[PDB]
Protein backbone atom coordinates (compact mmCIF):
# COMPACT_ATOMS: atom_id res chain seq x y z
CA UNK A 1 0.00 0.00 0.00
CA UNK A 2 0.95 3.67 -0.16
CA UNK A 3 -0.05 7.06 1.24
CA UNK A 4 -2.99 8.66 -0.57
CA UNK A 5 3.19 14.08 2.73
CA UNK A 6 6.82 15.15 2.59
CA UNK A 7 6.88 14.97 6.39
CA UNK A 8 6.21 11.22 6.10
CA UNK A 9 9.00 10.13 3.76
CA UNK A 10 11.14 12.33 6.01
CA UNK A 11 9.91 10.10 8.85
CA UNK A 12 8.81 13.04 11.02
CA UNK A 13 5.97 11.28 12.88
CA UNK A 14 5.18 8.24 14.97
CA UNK A 15 2.31 6.30 13.43
CA UNK A 16 -0.69 4.70 15.08
CA UNK A 17 -2.58 1.78 13.49
CA UNK A 18 -6.29 2.10 14.34
CA UNK A 19 -8.07 -1.26 13.95
CA UNK A 20 -11.86 -1.21 13.52
CA UNK A 21 -12.92 -4.57 14.89
CA UNK A 22 -15.82 -5.87 12.83
CA UNK A 23 -15.07 -3.79 9.74
CA UNK A 24 -14.64 -6.30 6.94
CA UNK A 25 -11.49 -4.59 5.62
CA UNK A 26 -9.43 -5.22 8.75
CA UNK A 27 -8.60 -8.82 8.05
CA UNK A 28 -5.40 -10.11 9.58
CA UNK A 29 -3.59 -9.74 6.27
CA UNK A 30 -4.67 -6.15 5.71
CA UNK A 31 -3.66 -5.46 9.29
CA UNK A 32 -0.25 -6.97 8.53
CA UNK A 33 0.06 -4.69 5.52
CA UNK A 34 -0.78 -1.56 7.52
CA UNK A 35 1.77 -2.51 10.16
CA UNK A 36 4.50 -3.17 7.57
CA UNK A 37 3.76 0.22 5.96
CA UNK A 38 3.91 1.93 9.33
CA UNK A 39 7.21 0.27 10.32
CA UNK A 40 8.69 1.51 7.05
CA UNK A 41 7.46 5.08 7.43
CA UNK A 42 7.48 5.70 11.17
CA UNK A 43 9.91 8.01 12.95
CA UNK A 44 10.47 5.26 15.51
CA UNK A 45 7.36 3.54 16.84
CA UNK A 46 4.14 1.99 15.62
CA UNK A 47 1.22 1.92 18.07
CA UNK A 48 -1.54 -0.63 17.45
CA UNK A 49 -4.94 -0.19 19.07
CA UNK A 50 -8.62 -1.00 18.67
CA UNK A 51 -10.49 2.07 17.52
CA UNK A 52 -14.27 1.35 17.34
CA UNK A 53 -17.00 -1.22 16.58
CA UNK A 54 -19.27 0.48 13.96
CA UNK A 55 -21.77 -5.70 30.42
CA UNK A 56 -18.34 -6.09 31.97
CA UNK A 57 -17.15 -2.47 32.11
CA UNK A 58 -18.57 1.02 32.36
CA UNK A 59 -16.80 2.03 29.13
CA UNK A 60 -17.71 0.50 25.76
CA UNK A 61 -14.15 0.77 24.44
CA UNK A 62 -12.91 -1.01 27.55
CA UNK A 63 -15.57 -3.69 27.14
CA UNK A 64 -14.51 -4.19 23.50
CA UNK A 65 -10.86 -4.33 24.60
CA UNK A 66 -11.30 -7.14 27.11
CA UNK A 67 -13.82 -9.13 25.08
CA UNK A 68 -12.05 -9.01 21.72
CA UNK A 69 -8.89 -6.93 21.60
CA UNK A 70 -6.93 -9.39 23.71
CA UNK A 71 -7.44 -12.23 21.23
CA UNK A 72 -7.03 -9.99 18.21
CA UNK A 73 -3.70 -8.77 19.60
CA UNK A 74 -2.62 -12.37 20.19
CA UNK A 75 -3.29 -13.23 16.55
CA UNK A 76 -1.43 -10.09 15.51
CA UNK A 77 1.55 -10.90 17.71
CA UNK A 78 1.82 -14.38 16.19
CA UNK A 79 1.63 -13.16 12.60
CA UNK A 80 4.09 -10.35 13.28
CA UNK A 81 6.71 -12.57 14.86
CA UNK A 82 6.55 -14.73 11.71
CA UNK A 83 6.61 -11.84 9.19
CA UNK A 84 9.02 -9.34 10.75
CA UNK A 85 12.61 -9.35 11.93
CA UNK A 86 13.07 -9.24 15.68
CA UNK A 87 14.42 -5.70 15.57
CA UNK A 88 11.47 -4.50 13.50
CA UNK A 89 9.26 -6.12 16.16
CA UNK A 90 10.96 -3.87 18.72
CA UNK A 91 9.25 -0.84 17.12
CA UNK A 92 5.69 -2.08 17.80
CA UNK A 93 3.58 -1.22 20.86
CA UNK A 94 0.23 -2.88 21.55
CA UNK A 95 -1.81 -0.24 23.33
CA UNK A 96 -4.93 -1.36 25.18
CA UNK A 97 -7.71 1.04 26.03
CA UNK A 98 -6.21 1.67 29.48
CA UNK A 99 -2.86 2.64 27.91
CA UNK A 100 -4.64 5.42 26.01
CA UNK A 101 -7.42 6.39 28.42
CA UNK A 102 -5.24 8.11 30.98
CA UNK A 103 -6.66 10.72 33.32
CA UNK A 104 -5.99 13.59 30.89
CA UNK A 105 -7.85 11.76 28.11
CA UNK A 106 -10.79 11.07 30.41
CA UNK A 107 -11.38 14.76 31.12
CA UNK A 108 -11.73 15.35 27.38
CA UNK A 109 -14.25 12.49 27.20
CA UNK A 110 -16.10 13.90 30.21
CA UNK A 111 -16.33 17.26 28.48
CA UNK A 112 -17.95 15.55 25.50
CA UNK A 113 -20.41 13.52 27.59
CA UNK A 114 -21.41 16.67 29.45
CA UNK A 115 -21.90 18.47 26.15
CA UNK A 116 -23.89 15.46 24.84
CA UNK A 117 -26.34 15.75 27.75
CA UNK A 118 -26.67 19.55 27.66
CA UNK A 119 -26.39 20.66 24.01
CA UNK A 120 -29.31 19.31 22.05
CA UNK A 121 -27.85 20.49 18.74
CA UNK A 122 -24.78 18.40 19.56
CA UNK A 123 -26.90 15.49 20.80
CA UNK A 124 -28.99 15.47 17.66
CA UNK A 125 -26.01 15.78 15.34
CA UNK A 126 -24.24 12.83 16.97
CA UNK A 127 -27.41 10.74 16.85
CA UNK A 128 -28.32 11.50 13.24
CA UNK A 129 -24.70 10.54 12.69
CA UNK A 130 -25.27 7.06 14.11
CA UNK A 131 -28.64 6.91 12.34
CA UNK A 132 -26.98 7.35 8.97
CA UNK A 133 -24.19 4.83 9.57
CA UNK A 134 -26.73 2.17 10.55
CA UNK A 135 -29.29 3.00 7.87
CA UNK A 136 -27.05 1.00 5.53
CA UNK A 137 -26.98 -1.95 7.93
CA UNK A 138 -29.74 -4.45 7.33
CA UNK A 139 -30.42 -4.58 11.09
CA UNK A 140 -32.45 -1.89 12.85
CA UNK A 141 -32.02 -0.04 16.15
CA UNK A 142 -34.13 1.92 18.62
CA UNK A 143 -33.52 5.48 19.79
CA UNK A 144 -32.04 4.47 23.14
CA UNK A 145 -29.59 2.23 21.28
CA UNK A 146 -28.90 5.00 18.78
CA UNK A 147 -28.22 7.28 21.72
CA UNK A 148 -25.91 4.73 23.34
CA UNK A 149 -23.98 4.33 20.09
CA UNK A 150 -23.47 8.09 20.11
CA UNK A 151 -21.76 8.10 23.50
CA UNK A 152 -19.45 5.38 22.20
CA UNK A 153 -18.29 7.68 19.42
CA UNK A 154 -17.62 10.49 21.90
CA UNK A 155 -15.39 8.08 23.80
CA UNK A 156 -13.05 7.73 20.80
CA UNK A 157 -13.38 11.30 19.55
CA UNK A 158 -10.47 12.88 21.50
CA UNK A 159 -8.11 10.17 20.23
CA UNK A 160 -9.17 11.13 16.72
CA UNK A 161 -8.65 14.84 17.33
CA UNK A 162 -5.61 15.27 19.56
CA UNK A 163 -2.15 13.72 19.86
CA UNK A 164 -2.02 11.52 22.98
CA UNK A 165 0.44 9.14 24.60
CA UNK A 166 0.18 5.36 24.88
CA UNK A 167 2.57 3.83 27.40
CA UNK A 168 4.46 7.13 27.41
CA UNK A 169 4.79 7.39 23.61
CA UNK A 170 3.39 10.29 21.64
CA UNK A 171 2.09 9.36 18.20
CA UNK A 172 1.24 12.33 15.98
CA UNK A 173 -0.20 10.42 13.03
CA UNK A 174 -2.41 7.44 12.40
CA UNK A 175 -3.19 5.35 9.34
CA UNK A 176 -6.59 4.40 8.01
CA UNK A 177 -7.47 2.92 4.60
CA UNK A 178 -10.07 5.52 3.50
CA UNK A 179 -11.92 8.71 4.40
CA UNK A 180 -15.05 8.28 6.53
CA UNK A 181 -17.90 10.48 7.74
CA UNK A 182 -16.04 10.47 11.04
CA UNK A 183 -12.74 11.61 9.53
CA UNK A 184 -14.53 14.50 7.78
CA UNK A 185 -16.29 15.45 10.99
CA UNK A 186 -13.02 15.35 12.90
CA UNK A 187 -11.41 17.49 10.21
CA UNK A 188 -14.12 20.11 10.69
CA UNK A 189 -13.84 19.98 14.47
CA UNK A 190 -10.06 20.48 14.38
CA UNK A 191 -10.53 23.55 12.19
CA UNK A 192 -13.17 24.98 14.52
CA UNK A 193 -15.70 24.91 11.69
CA UNK A 194 -18.26 22.71 13.43
CA UNK A 195 -19.10 22.89 17.16
CA UNK A 196 -16.20 25.31 17.80
CA UNK A 197 -16.53 25.09 21.58
CA UNK A 198 -15.02 21.63 21.22
CA UNK A 199 -11.84 22.93 19.61
CA UNK A 200 -11.55 25.58 22.31
CA UNK A 201 -11.92 23.05 25.09
CA UNK A 202 -10.07 19.88 24.12
CA UNK A 203 -7.61 20.70 21.29
CA UNK A 204 -4.21 21.99 22.44
CA UNK A 205 -3.08 23.18 18.96
CA UNK A 206 -1.38 19.84 18.08
CA UNK A 207 -3.99 18.04 15.96
CA UNK A 208 -3.90 14.32 15.31
CA UNK A 209 -2.78 13.76 11.71
CA UNK A 210 -4.81 11.36 9.55
CA UNK A 211 -2.89 9.45 6.84
CA UNK A 212 -4.92 7.58 4.23
CA UNK A 213 -3.18 4.36 3.16
CA UNK A 214 -4.73 1.72 0.88
CA UNK A 215 -3.70 -0.55 -2.00
Numbering used by the authors: 1 to 4, 11 to 60, 70 to 230
What does the publication say?
Cyclodipeptide synthases (CDPSs) use aminoacylated tRNA (aa-tRNA) substrates to form peptide bonds between two amino acids yielding a cyclic dipeptide product (CDP). ParaCDPS from Parabacteroides sp. 20_3 (GenBank: EFK64745.1) produces cyclo(His-Phe)8 whilst ParcuCDPS from Parcubacteria bacterium RAAC4_OD1_1 (GenBank: ETB63777.1) can synthesise both cyclo(His-Glu) and cyclo(His-Pro)9. ParcuCDPS belongs to the XYP sub-group of the CDPS family, characterised by the presence of 3 residues: X40 where X is a non-conserved residue, Y202, and P203 (numbering respective to AlbC). ParcuCDPS displays a Rossman-fold common throughout the CDPS family.
Inspired by HisRS and histidine recognition more generally, and by the only high resolution structure of a CDPS with a ligand bound, we systematically altered three unique residues in ParcuCDPS P1, which we hypothesised to be participating in crucial interactions with the polar side chain of histidine. We first designed Generation 1 containing seven P1 mutants (Y55F; Y55V; E174A; E174H; E174L; Y189F and Y189L), and these variants were cloned, expressed in E.coli, purified and used for activity assays. By mutating the P1 residues, the activity of the variants was vastly reduced with E174A and E174H incapable of tolerating histidine as a substrate. Further investigation into the changes imposed by these mutants was performed by solving the crystal structures of a select few mutants containing changes to the active site or the pocket residues. The mutant structures were able to be solved using WT as a model and retained an equivalent fold to ParcuCDPS (Supplementary Notes 4 and 7 relating to Supplementary Figs. 13 and 14). Therefore, the disruption of activity is caused exclusively by the change in these few residues which appear important for the enzyme to produce a CDP. Having hindered the capacity of ParcuCDPS to recognize histidine, we then focussed on Generation 3 composed of three double mutants (Y55V + E174L; Y55V + Y189L; E174L + Y189L) and a triple mutant (Y55V + E174L + Y189L), aimed at switching the substrate specificity to a less polar amino acid. This was because Generation 1 and 2 variants essentially incorporate hydrophobic and non-polar amino acids potentially altering the overall environment and electrostatics of P1.
